[PDB]
C-alpha cells in the first residue's frame, strides 16, 4: 500500500534570483531527483523510468522542463501582481502524486505551500485555497484557473498519468521495494543513568525494540525517532532510565521481519 510523492521546493530570493529542486519518493525509497543545475530529471534507481517507453518518458520530461521555466516566471509575475502585499524572499513548496490501493483504486493529490503554510491544492478541475488561507490568494487563484490548458494537463497528470506510472514502478522495483536488510544492535549508557539500545541497518521501517528483564517488558522504555542511514536502511534507538547498580540481567530484544523469527537479544 504505497504513496508516490513529488516533493518540489522553490526559493525566490529577490526579483531576479530563484532555484527549483525536486526529489521523488515511492514509499520511503528515492526514485528521482531534479536539481536546478540539471536540464534533465535524474533516475536514482535502475527502474525509475517504470514501464514507460523511452518516447513516453521524453515527452513527459519535456512537459516538466517547460513547467519549471514557466512556473518560475509565473511566481515572479504573481509577486508583482500582489505587491506590496507580499515580497521576497518567498518559498513555494509542492507535494504531488498519488497513493496506491489494492485492485485499481487510488487518490491523487497536489498540495501547495507558501512560506511553509499549506494554502492551495488542485481539486477536481481547478485550483482552490484550503481553510486558513489568506484571502489575497483569491486573485492568484482566479488567474491560474483562467489557464484552461494547464487545468486539462494537471487533471490528466493526476487522474491518469500518476496511477498508471506508479503501477509500472511497483512492477519494475518490486525487489528493491520488498527487500529485507537485518538490524545490528549494540548497547551503551550515560544522580540517574540512561541505558541505550541502538538498532541500525534494517529495512523496511517497521521494527520492535524493548528493554527486558527475562520476560518482563520494561514498560518505561522510551522509543526514539526513525533516523535514516545513507544506504536506504533505517536507524532507531530505545532508551531506558534506571538506578545505578540496577543494570544486572537487563537485555534489549528486537523483532524485525528480516530476522525470520530469530530475535536479537543483547545482554548487559
Amino acid at each position: 500500500n504505497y504513496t508516490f510523492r513529488c516533493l518540489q521546493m522553490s526559493s525566490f530570493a529577490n526579483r531576479s534570483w530563484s532555484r527549483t529542486d525536486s526529489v521523488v519518493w515511492l514509499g520511503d525509497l528515492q526514485t528521482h531527483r531534479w536539481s536546478n543545475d540539471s536540464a534533465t530529471i535524474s533516475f536514482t534507481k535502475p527502474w525509475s523510468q517504470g514501464k514507460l517507453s523511452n518516447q513516453q518518458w521524453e515527452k513527459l520530461q519535456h512537459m516538466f522542463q517547460v513547467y519549471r521555466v514557466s512556473f518560475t516566471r509565473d511566481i515572479q509575475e504573481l509577486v508583482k501582481m500582489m505587491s506590496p502585499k507580499e515580497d521576497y524572499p518567498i518559498e513555494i513548496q509542492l507535494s504531488a502524486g498519488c497513493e496506491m490501493y489494492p485492485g485499481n483504486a487510488s487518490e491523487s493529490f497536489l498540495h501547495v505551500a507558501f512560506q511553509g503554510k499549506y494554502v492551495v491544492r488542485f481539486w477536481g478541475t481547478s485550483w482552490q485555497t484550503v481553510p486558513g488561507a489568506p484571502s489575497w490568494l483569491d486573485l492568484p487563484i482566479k488567474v491560474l484557473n483562467a489557464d484552461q490548458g494547464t487545468s486539462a494537463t494537471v487533471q490528466m497528470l493526476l487522474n491518469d498519468t500518476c496511477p498508471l506510472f506508479v503501477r509500472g514502478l511497483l512492477e519494475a522495483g518490486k525487489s528493491d521495494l520488498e527487500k529485507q536488510e537485518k538490524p545490528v544492535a549494540w548497547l551503551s549508557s550515560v544522580g540517574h543513568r540512561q541505558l541505550v539500545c541502538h538498532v541500525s541497518g534494517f529495512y523496511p521501517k517497521p521494527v520492535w525494540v524493548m528493554w527486558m528483564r527475562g520476560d518482563q517488558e520494561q514498560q518505561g522504555t522510551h522509543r526514539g525517532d526513525f533516523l535514516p542511514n545513507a544506504d536506504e536502511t533505517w536507524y532507531l534507538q530505545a532508551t531506558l532510565d534506571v538506578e545505578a547498580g540496577e543494570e544486572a540481567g537487563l537485555a534489549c530484544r528486537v523483532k524485525h521481519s528480516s530476522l525470520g523469527g530469530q530475535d536479537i537479544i543483547l545482554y548487559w
Partner: T-cell receptor, first 111, second 113 residues
Framework: AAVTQSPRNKVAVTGGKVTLSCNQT?????MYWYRQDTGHGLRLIHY???????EKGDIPDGYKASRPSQENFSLILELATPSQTSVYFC??????????FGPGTRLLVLE | TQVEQSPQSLVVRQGENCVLQ??????????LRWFKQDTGKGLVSLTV?????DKTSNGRYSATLDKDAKHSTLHITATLLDDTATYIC?????????????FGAGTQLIVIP
Amino acid sequence: AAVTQSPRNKVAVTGGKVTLSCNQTNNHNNMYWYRQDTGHGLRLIHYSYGAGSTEKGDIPDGYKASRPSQENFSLILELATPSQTSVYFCASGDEGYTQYFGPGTRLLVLE
Amino acid sequence: TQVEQSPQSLVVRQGENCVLQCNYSVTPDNHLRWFKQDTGKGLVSLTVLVDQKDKTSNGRYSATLDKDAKHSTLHITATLLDDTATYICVVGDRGSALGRLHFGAGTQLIVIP
C-alpha cells in the same frame, strides 16, 4: 470591451515632456504599453497589474509609466528623443489572455 | 525574433487566393492570433487558434496551427481590395494574463484591383 488613447497624434521637440495616456472603462486590472516600428513586431515597454503598480517590460528605457487609477495607464517620456518616434499602442485585459488594443497613438520627435 | 513571417511582402490580383506563413520558436505556445492592420489604422483580430492541431475560419479567412512544427498559415480566399494591409502573427505563451505576447513583424499584402 473598448480602450481609448489620447492624444492620437503628437509632434514634439527633443527634450520635451510627452505624455501618452490610455483610458479603459472595462474595470480590467491589467494594462500594457507597446510601440510598433517598421521591421519589428510590437514590443512591450511598461505594464501594470492595478492602480499603483508599474512594471518594466522588454524595452522600458526612456519611458516612465504611471497607473494613478484602474481607468488610466499613462506613458511618460520625460526627456523626448528622435528614437522615440513610433506608433504607440495601449492594451487592457482581465485575468484571461486576451489583450484588447487601443487605436494607436502616432508620435514624431523632431530635433 | 522568436516569431517569423513569410512572405515579407506580396502582390496579388483581385480574386486570387493567397497563403501567409508564420513560424515560431516561442515556448510554450498556448495560442496563436492573426491580426489585420490597415495602413494608418490599428489591430483587428481575424482568428485565434488554440489546439495542438487546430483549424479556424472567418468568412474568406481560414487558418491552421500545428504546435509540433510550431507553424501556422492564414489563407485568404478571393482577395478584395480592402485586404491590402499588413498581417500580423502573435503567439501568447500562457492561457491567462500571466502571458507575454510575442509579435511577428508582419506580412505586407497588396491586392491589385
